[PDB]
Amino acid sequence: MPVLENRAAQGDITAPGGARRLTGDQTAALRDSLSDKPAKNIILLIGDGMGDSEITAARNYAEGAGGFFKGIDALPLTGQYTHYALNKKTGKPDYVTDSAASATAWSTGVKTYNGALGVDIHEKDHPTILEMAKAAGLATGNVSTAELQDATPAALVAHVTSRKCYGPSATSEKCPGNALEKGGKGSITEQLLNARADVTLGGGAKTFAETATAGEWQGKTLREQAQARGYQLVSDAASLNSVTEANQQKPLLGLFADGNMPVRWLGPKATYHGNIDKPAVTCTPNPQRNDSVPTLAQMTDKAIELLSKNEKGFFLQVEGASIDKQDHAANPCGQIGETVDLDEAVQRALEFAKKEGNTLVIVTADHAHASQIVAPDTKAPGLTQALNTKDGAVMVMSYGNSEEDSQENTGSQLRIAAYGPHAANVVGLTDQTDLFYTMKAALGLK
């Protein structure tokens, strides 16, 4: 099963045929990409907010328009999927989802209202694909660059009526019915600790500082509870590399930042008429990113090494979290840098899957975002910025959907791509909930 090795412009883009990405007929390669054999493992990579617009902007900047992302763009089976949410009150579609409702959709197979995690519009819990894999005896991993209580990773292990219920304090107040002391299952963090994935890596150390209001570990901080329940905690690259085993006996929990891990690139915020009134930007690497902080590609690779020791197989979800956040911040460089970061992780995943042979790799996003690529001379109502791309030309980016501080999500359907057994299921138009069924069936779970 072939991954697309090179879809960059074949030559001189100004000459006939120079901008072609194809070198011959793809029929036979596509036939070789089709397999309904069972998937032993599944690696799901999510770029938060990574719509087709975000992937194009990032490719134009980092690789040039005729360039090619060796990870993101190399998946051969591609399609478009819908991710609308539901209005809790009426049960009707809500056309623009938030990250909580979308994550619940592919992780449980049931649509829900914006803000919910692991429950339907009736607030009923539904098992997640991770809980299910684990019950079947597979190793499971949840990796992200955001706080681990954030919507995307949390949806795999928590069931609460509001994404805001990070730890005990917030829960008692926002999710009283889930509050441990009110007999509920607990806050996002408490449920995370209970779920016990073999490998969990990300930010969000902060909430682990809270102390439980009830239960067996009442009085202890959630950090204390984790060590007590037998988790191996790590907080830096070095310690992370030191790990050799990760299992139910000694599950791994890496907390590399108080909040969200640091962004790869820095650049200024987009401004009103910024492509007109201001010079073009060249993004710059973040000096704080750090040698002590594992990159997404490093966290991905470690997770694969450890989960790979389970003969039954594994389920891994990897999230390039700050794409969405930088997009909300109307910060092109932060946004593009996080997409490039994600590409590196996709590469690692694809390299393993290619050699292992029974691994389904899927790359997609939870929903679309605000950023649009507009003409250089554009006079727009929102925030714009001109950037200097790898082509040595200027690309302008516009965030024009909000007058508030942060730019919002949008509802366009968007790319979904896959490689490996059962990837045919992402071709054509599908729904985000079909993703849950595709993964459950490929792994043969019940």
Q: Which of residues 18-77 bind Mg ion (CB under 5 A)?
A: 48
Q: Which is nearer to Zn ion, 104 or 409 (CB)?
A: 409
Show the site string, 381-420: x = touches a second copy by CB under 8 A, - = not.
Answer: xx------x-xxx-x--x-xxxxx---xxxxxxxx-x---
Query: Among this protein's residues, is 99 annotated catalytic?
Result: yes
Return the CA Rg of the chain. Answer: 21
Q: Return d(Cα 66, Cα 19) in angstroms, integer.
A: 7
Closest approach of Cβ 99 to Zn ion, in Å?
3
Sketch the per residue contact string, 296 through 325, with Mg ion: x for CB under 5 A, - otherwise: -------------------------x----
User: Strand 41-47 to strand 314-320: parallel, antiparallel, or no bridges (unpaired)?
Assistant: parallel
Considering 33, 35, 53, 99, which one is annotated as catalytic?
99
**Residue 324 near Zn ion by CB under 5 A:** yes
Stretch that binds Zn ion, among 87-95, 121-129, 257-265, 409-417 (CB under 5 A): 409-417
H helices within 129-257, ranges in order? 129-135, 151-154, 168-174, 188-195, 222-228, 237-242
Q: What whole-number distance in Å separates Cα of residue 390 and Cα of residue 388?
A: 7
Q: Of the two residues 285 and 444, which places its CB atom closer to a second copy in the complex?
A: 444
Binding flag, residue 75, a second copy (CB under 8 A): yes
- Site residues for Zn ion, 339-378, by CB under 5 A, read 366
**Could you count the other beta carbons within 10 Å of the beta carbon of residue 401?**
16
**Element (H or E) spanning 371, and its range?**
none
428 sits near a second copy (criterion: CB under 8 A): yes
Residue closest to Zn ion (Cβ)? 99
- Residue 76 touching a second copy (CB under 8 A): yes
Contacting a second copy within 78-97 (CB under 8 A)? 78-80, 82, 84, 86-87, 90-96
- Taking CB atoms within 8 Å and a gap of at least 24, the contacts of 63-67 are 63/8, 63/390, 64/389, 64/390, 64/391, 65/9, 65/13, 65/389, 65/391, 66/8, 66/9, 66/13, 66/19, 66/21, 67/8, 67/9, 67/390
Residue by residue, DSSP assigns 144-175 as: EEEETTSHHHHTTT--BS-TT--SHHHHHHH-
| Contact status: 123 vs a second copy (CB under 8 A) | no
Site for Zn ion in 150-189 (CB under 5 A): none
Coil/strand/helix, residue 211: strand
Q: Which one of 48-56, 68-76, 138-146, 348-356 is the stretch in contact with Zn ion (CB under 5 A)? A: 48-56
The entry of Mg ion, a second copy, Zn ion, none near residue 357 (CB within 5 to 8 angstroms by kind) is none
Residue 47 is a binding residue for a second copy (CB under 8 A): no
Min dist CB 49 to Zn ion, Å, is 5
Q: Judged by CB under 5 A, does residue 99 bind Zn ion?
A: yes
| Phi, psi dihedrals of residue 422, rounded to the nearest 5° | 75, 5
Task: Write b or e for each residue in 217-255: b if 16 or more Cβ atoms lie within 10 A of its Cβ, otherwise e.
Answer: beeebbbebbeeeebbebebbeebeebeebbeeebbbbb
Residue 152 as a binder of Mg ion (CB under 5 A): the answer is yes
Stretch that binds Zn ion, among 64-72, 294-302, 320-328, 391-399 (CB under 5 A): 320-328
- The least CB distance from residue 257 to Zn ion, in Å, is 19
Pick 136 or 373: Cβ nearer a second copy: 373
CA dihedral 406, 282, 279, 370 (to 10 degrees): -30
Using CB under 5 A as the criterion, which residues of the chain lie in contact with Mg ion when the complex forms? 48, 99, 152, 321
Which residues are designated catalytic? 99
